[PDB]
Amino acid sequence: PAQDNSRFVIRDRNWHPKALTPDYKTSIARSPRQALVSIPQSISETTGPNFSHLGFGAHDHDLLLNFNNGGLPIGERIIVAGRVVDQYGKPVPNTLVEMWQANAGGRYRHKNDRYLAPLDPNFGGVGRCLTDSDGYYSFRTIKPGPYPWRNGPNDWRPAHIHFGISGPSIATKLITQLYFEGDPLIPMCPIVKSIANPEAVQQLIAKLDMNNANPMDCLAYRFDIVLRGQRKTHFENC
């Protein structure tokens, strides 16, 4: 079983979005009004699931083939790849990276999506993989379209892919969103702007990566992810 053998650098909650960001209307009623209670790290917080033994399907990381109903999805073919490191720069190997997204027209394959834009019969929109021994992951997909939502009267999410990353402990687990280099919708989005520091937003913007493209086939985008720094305990209890 798991042991308490490390500590995780405290989160900067002014770098992360705060809970109450009223331009993102749903956050008003879904944000606490009391302060978070700080607690020291124990084995409950410094351990978490490792997914090395989860059974992955052959195409789990390939959204071009994992919802195959007779053909290829329509859309901009792309590899999304990168490295998961911690704040000390150390690779995070064998960690679960999950992603989900809309199709090329900004339609989600989800019963609650009321957007008119059509489903793609060959696109599901979910992927998962494990980082390799050097911290690298990769997915193949189509670039999601922007899509309109009921926040303000004319609000549109930039093209984005939802990411979840487990990391070494429940303390490191993160859900975030990847955006795309140069998208003019990014600075207009109240969800992006839940993050108060524009330098923090920069960290969510995937860069075009021509070096990783397959010629005559697919483009590529690089998205590196930084989880909380992990260090050994020192001078504790003594």
Binding site: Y24, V37, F51, D60, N112, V126, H162
Partner: protein, 200 residues
């Protein structure tokens, strides 16, 4: 001062979180292996329990699109981190509220006692992370058990909550669901009876 690389900032899981992490609930086909809400095979050691709850916003309305991740010790107080659908027990699971009733369920065993870093026993607990549309960074909480009152009163984590009335927000209520032992743990994100959320 020394500045490390900045952590990638959080964003909301959004309304369609189920596409990626709760495929059936999205209305979609599932893959061969899914991470879900049955932590214990029927013959796993310990006392088998059902956990269930609803999640409320600051207006008293159900949050019908919430997603929860849980992490708990097994009955012997050990964290089983090698996740595997063939394990008798996984310390990790996931659940989500149904859209109709807004209710999540988890099938597990009551966790055993584990010590904090100073060697002091913590009361039996389940670590919970709550995600949803409108929640920009996930909320951490703990589910403790109302039939562990002696343990709860001495828990060095519960004791960090300054007000006793707020401690009460973390104590699940023993009940019976279809005749079986269960504990209900409702979460109030905001307002009257607001659930304690942790930073660590």
């Amino acid at each position: 001062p020394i500045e490390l690389l900045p952590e990638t900032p959080s964003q909301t899981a959004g309304p369609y979180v189920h596409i990626g992490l709760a495929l059936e609930a999205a209305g979609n086909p599932t893959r061969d292996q899914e991470i879900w809400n049955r932590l214990a095979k029927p013959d796993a050691p310990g006392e088998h329990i059902l956990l269930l709850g609803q999640v409320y916003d600051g207006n008293g309305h159900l949050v019908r699109d919430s997603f929860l991740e849980v992490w708990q010790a097994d009955a012997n107080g050990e964290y089983q981190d090698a996740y595997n659908l063939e394990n008798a027990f996984n310390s990790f699971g996931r659940t989500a509220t149904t859209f109709d009733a807004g209710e999540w369920t988890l099938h597990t065993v009551k966790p055993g006692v584990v010590n904090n870093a100073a060697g002091v026993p913590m009361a039996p607990h389940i670590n919970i992370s709550l995600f949803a549309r409108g929640i920009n960074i996930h909320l951490h909480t703990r589910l403790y058990f109302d039939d562990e009152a002696q343990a709860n009163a001495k828990c060095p984590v519960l004791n960090l909550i300054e007000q006793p009335q707020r401690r009460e927000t973390l104590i699940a209520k023993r009940c019976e669901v279809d005749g079986k032992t269960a504990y209900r743990f409702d979460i109030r994100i905001q307002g009257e009876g607001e659930t304690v959320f942790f930073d660590f």
